[PDB]
Scaffold this active site. Sequence first.
Site, short mmCIF file in Angstrom:
data_model
loop_
_atom_site.label_atom_id
_atom_site.label_comp_id
_atom_site.label_asym_id
_atom_site.label_seq_id
_atom_site.Cartn_x
_atom_site.Cartn_y
_atom_site.Cartn_z
CG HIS A 40 10.43 30.65 13.70
ND1 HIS A 40 10.43 31.63 14.31
CD2 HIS A 40 9.58 30.68 12.68
CE1 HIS A 40 9.65 32.44 13.79
NE2 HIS A 40 9.21 32.13 12.77
CD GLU A 52 14.54 40.90 -4.05
OE1 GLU A 52 14.14 41.80 -4.78
OE2 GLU A 52 14.56 39.64 -4.58
CG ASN A 54 8.02 44.18 -6.89
OD1 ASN A 54 7.87 42.81 -6.27
ND2 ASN A 54 6.99 44.92 -6.77
CB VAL A 57 9.69 43.36 -10.15
CG1 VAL A 57 10.32 44.10 -11.25
CG2 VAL A 57 8.02 43.18 -10.19
CD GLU A 62 16.63 42.93 -7.90
OE1 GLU A 62 17.38 43.29 -8.67
OE2 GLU A 62 15.13 42.95 -7.79
CG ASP A 84 13.18 31.76 16.89
OD1 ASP A 84 13.69 31.12 15.94
OD2 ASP A 84 12.11 32.26 16.43
CG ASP A 171 2.76 42.99 16.07
OD1 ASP A 171 3.93 42.91 16.03
OD2 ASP A 171 1.73 41.91 16.54
CB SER A 172 6.46 42.13 12.96
OG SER A 172 6.60 41.54 14.26
CD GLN A 174 0.99 34.89 11.55
OE1 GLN A 174 0.39 35.83 10.97
NE2 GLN A 174 1.01 34.28 12.63
N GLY A 175 5.45 35.74 7.91
CA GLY A 175 6.37 36.29 6.81
C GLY A 175 7.51 37.14 7.02
CB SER A 177 9.50 34.75 11.00
OG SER A 177 8.25 34.65 11.73
N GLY A 178 12.26 36.49 11.35
CA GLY A 178 13.44 36.34 11.14
C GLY A 178 14.37 37.77 10.67
CA LIG Z 1 13.41 42.46 -6.80
#
Ligand SMILES: [Ca+2]
Length: 223
Positions: A40, A52, A54, A57, A62, A84, A171-172, A174-175, A177-178
């Site tokens: 999804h 990653e 932050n 920033v 990265e 999923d 909990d986990s 929205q955002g 996900s995955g």
């Molecule tokens: Ca960063």
Amino acid sequence: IVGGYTCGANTVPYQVSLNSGYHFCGGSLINSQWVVSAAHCYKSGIQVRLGEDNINVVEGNEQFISASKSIVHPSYNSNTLNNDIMLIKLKSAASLNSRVASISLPTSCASAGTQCLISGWGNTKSSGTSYPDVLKCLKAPILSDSSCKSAYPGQITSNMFCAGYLEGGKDSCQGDSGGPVVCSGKLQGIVSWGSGCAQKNKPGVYTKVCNYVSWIKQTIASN
Ligand SMILES: [Ca+2]
């Protein structure tokens, strides 16, 4: 992540951010050229961001690598969220080091009661909205299949499991996900869905990665 803690920079070295101009989902690096995420979370134009903390920033560890190919599970049903899971191939291989590392796939399905590490940049409030910049972490147990099914009648398939706390608060969300659910050093879950976040008797529902190891391995071997 609701009710968790600040992971610390690059302490979760397999955690990736999927970026399409902005963070929109998590994922897990499983070798130098492949990420596993939730079906999804599919969209075109994905850039994978490794190393990653932050996400707003540039801090110096990265790697930004565009996806060359996305593979949504053949039997993904968006209406039921069954299957999923999706694979994302990177245009070039990530450089692996201590802060960017792959997570092992399971050799068996973990058990209810096992403590796991869930992570992501998703919402940290259950009745409100606040998205963190740095990676958040939650230690949470796998819940029994029967309590999962009792919490979500008619909705839990053999490809799903619940993890978290029936009392709510952690909990986990929205955002997230995955992103990963890691137990004893193996990727057992993918953040998939739930009713709200951190609500009483509505724990998080996760894709059951151990069901998909054969598909992941043969897909990677041929793409
Ligand atoms: Ca960063």
